[PDB]
Amino acid sequence: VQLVESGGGLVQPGGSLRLSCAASGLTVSSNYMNWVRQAPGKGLEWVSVIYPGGTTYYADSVKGRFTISRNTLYLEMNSLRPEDTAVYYCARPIYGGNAGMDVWGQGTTVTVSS
Amino acid sequence: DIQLTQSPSSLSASVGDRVTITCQASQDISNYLNWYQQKPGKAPKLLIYDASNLETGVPSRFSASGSGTDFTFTISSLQPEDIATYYCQHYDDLPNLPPTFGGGTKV
Amino acid sequence: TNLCPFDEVFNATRFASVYAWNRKRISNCVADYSVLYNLAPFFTFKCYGVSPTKLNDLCFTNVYADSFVIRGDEVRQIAPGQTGNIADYNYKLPDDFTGCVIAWNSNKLDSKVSGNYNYLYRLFRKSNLKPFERDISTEIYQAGNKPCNGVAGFNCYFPLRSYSFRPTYGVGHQPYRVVVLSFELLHAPATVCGPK
């Protein structure tokens, strides 16, 4: 198994951005894809998850502003706030009792400059 | 929702002495416990997935077993190569309780 | 002389699991719909469409009854307009509904010292559940492009998993028993409604 990610960089606030977590070798159609972000020098957070069927659950901070699209995984932005940066991770967390589920991406970057 | 607190994070000790970490729960969780061992600059990898049971593929040098709402994890001896940071995790996505991560301890 | 056997549904030693729930038709009755509230202490009693007083007055043809066992916190998922794990792959409730839901605790009867591993539930599926169908067959579930071999290894799963109960858990995870009533639109002459 292997995961691949791409996209991310300079962007201005108030303008959307698109993250392409294009998966390879993993069936994105039926898997519990998950998004988690790691702030610089802070604790990890949870963002959103998807079921094999059409279903989306969102965290408290990102209120109705993130969108996740299901052989690739996509994420989109909307009026990106100043308090948003740092690395993002595509996760396939462990579900059930079997071992070997967890696979994670390498990393990305985002910054609001001018 | 559930709020998680941990033992003092800044723990450093000589080799051969057990190191103990405690994870506490706020809204009565039940054995929904993972221990994501992590290293600087790399993504975390699962180490303990369901309470007492250990992930297969690593030599049995870590002591972890518990239940209820307060959990303890112990290292019998810390080799220099095994220095890392360890987190606490409650896995779920049900509407009642969302998943959360702990503060994290650096060993 | 002929009353619906509500005692048979309410008093049964063994209850069906969530993924294989029972359905029982009811016809040709005069039945006390008001006996429930004083029958036994019931922790929850919630119904839709019709107020409690109009059940014995309005007169129906057929009655549908279902029953199963779920843990404490997931009672709220059995309602129109709600989504989740059970609501999507185990028991789907249609948009319109004229029935009632009754859920009561049964912690003492079933959970012994060793535990109850008989109950099951389904966790993995390929697509959502259509309203009002029932499934029992279980088989291998694949998550990879390669076709699944006989051995389920590293890409093939066992879709079913069970519960575990002890007397000393908290309030939220204690077992509960749920009974759902339903009603149906009619064109044949009615047969089941209140006594006088």
**Which sequence spans correspond to the domains of chain B?**
5-106
Beta strands in C22-152 (DSSP E): 22-26, 44-47, 63-71, 100-105, 120-122, 141-142
Rounded alpha-carbon distances, angstroms, from residue B85 to B39, B52, B77, B101: 6, 20, 15, 13
- Closest by Cβ to A43, choosing from B34, B98, B104: B104
Q: Which of C122, C116, C124, C142 is nearest to C134 (CA)?
A: C122
- Phi and psi (nearest 5°) for C73? -70, -25
- Tokens encoding B14: 């000589």
- Tokens encoding A95: 């579900």
- Residue C86 near residue C96 (C-beta atoms within 8 A): no
Amino acid identity of residue C47, one-letter, is C
C20-44 b/e with 16+ CB inside 10 Å = b? ebeeeebeebebebeebeeeeeeee
- Residue C46 near residue C97 (C-beta atoms within 8 A): no
- Phi and psi (nearest 5°) for C109? -65, -50
Rg (CA), chain C: 19
Residues sharing a CB contact under 8 Å with residue A5, sequence separation 6 or more, in sequence order: A19, A20, A21, A22, A90, A105, A106, A107, A108
The residue range of the domain holding A54 is 1-107
Rounded to the nearest angstrom, the minimum Cα separation between C170 and chain B is 7
- Residue A56 near residue A16 (C-beta atoms within 8 A): no
Q: Which of C109, C122, C104, C113 is nearest to C165 (CA)?
A: C113
- Tokens encoding C74: 């997931």
- Tokens encoding C150: 């006989």
Residues sharing a CB contact under 8 Å with residue C39, sequence separation 6 or more, in sequence order: C10
Collapse the DSSP code of B90 into the 3-class scheme (helix H, G, I; strand E, B; otherwise coil) and give the result: strand
Collapse the DSSP code of C75 into the 3-class scheme (helix H, G, I; strand E, B; otherwise coil) and give the result: helix
C49 lies within 8 A of chain B by CB:
no
Q: How many domains does chain A have?
A: 1
Rg (CA), chain A: 14
Write down how long chain B is: 107
Number of helices (H) and strands (E) in chain A: give both, helices first. Answer: 0, 9
DSSP H stretches of helix in C83-150: 86-89, 107-110
- Residue C26 near residue C64 (C-beta atoms within 8 A): yes
Give long-range contacts, CB 8 A cutoff, 24+ apart: C57-61. C57/C194, C58/C193, C59/C190, C59/C192, C59/C193, C59/C194, C60/C183, C60/C184, C60/C186, C60/C190, C60/C192, C60/C193, C61/C27, C61/C184, C61/C186, C61/C188, C61/C189, C61/C190, C61/C191, C61/C192
- Tell me which H or E stretch contains A46: strand A44-50
d(CA C193, CA C26): 11
d(CA B93, CA A49): 8
Number of helices (H) and strands (E) in chain C: give both, helices first. Answer: 4, 9
C-alpha C102 chain-centroid distance: 10
- Residue C102 near residue C42 (C-beta atoms within 8 A): yes
- Chain B contacts of C76, Cβ < 8 Å? 95
- Tokens encoding A86: 């740092």
Per CATH, the homologous superfamily of domain B5-106 is Immunoglobulins (2.60.40.10)
Domain boundaries, chain C: 6-183
d(CA C73, CA C84): 12
Amino acid identity of residue C117, one-letter, is Y
- Closest by Cβ to A52, choosing from C83, C126, C144: C126
d(CA C122, CA C134): 12
C6-183 fold: Alpha-Beta Plaits (3.30.70)
Strand partners, C177: C69, C104
Amino acid identity of residue B65, one-letter, is S
- Chain A contacts of C154, Cβ < 8 Å? 100
- Tell me which H or E stretch contains A68: strand A67-69
- Phi and psi (nearest 5°) for C53? -75, -25
- Tokens encoding C171: 């309030």
Q: Give the residue carrying structure tokens 């040098």.
A: B61
d(CA C53, CA A88): 56
d(CA A1, CA A72): 15
- Residue A59 near residue A92 (C-beta atoms within 8 A): no
- Chain C contacts of B94, Cβ < 8 Å? 73-74, 84-85
d(CA C8, CA B90): 41
Best residue of C77, C86, C125 to probe chain A, by most A CBs closer than 10 Å: C125
Residue A112 in any domain: the answer is: no
Q: Is B68 exposed, middle or buried (0-12, 13-18, 19+ CB in 10 A)?
A: middle
- Residue A11 near residue A78 (C-beta atoms within 8 A): no
Rg (CA), chain B: 14
Q: What is the resolution of this structure in A?
A: 3.8
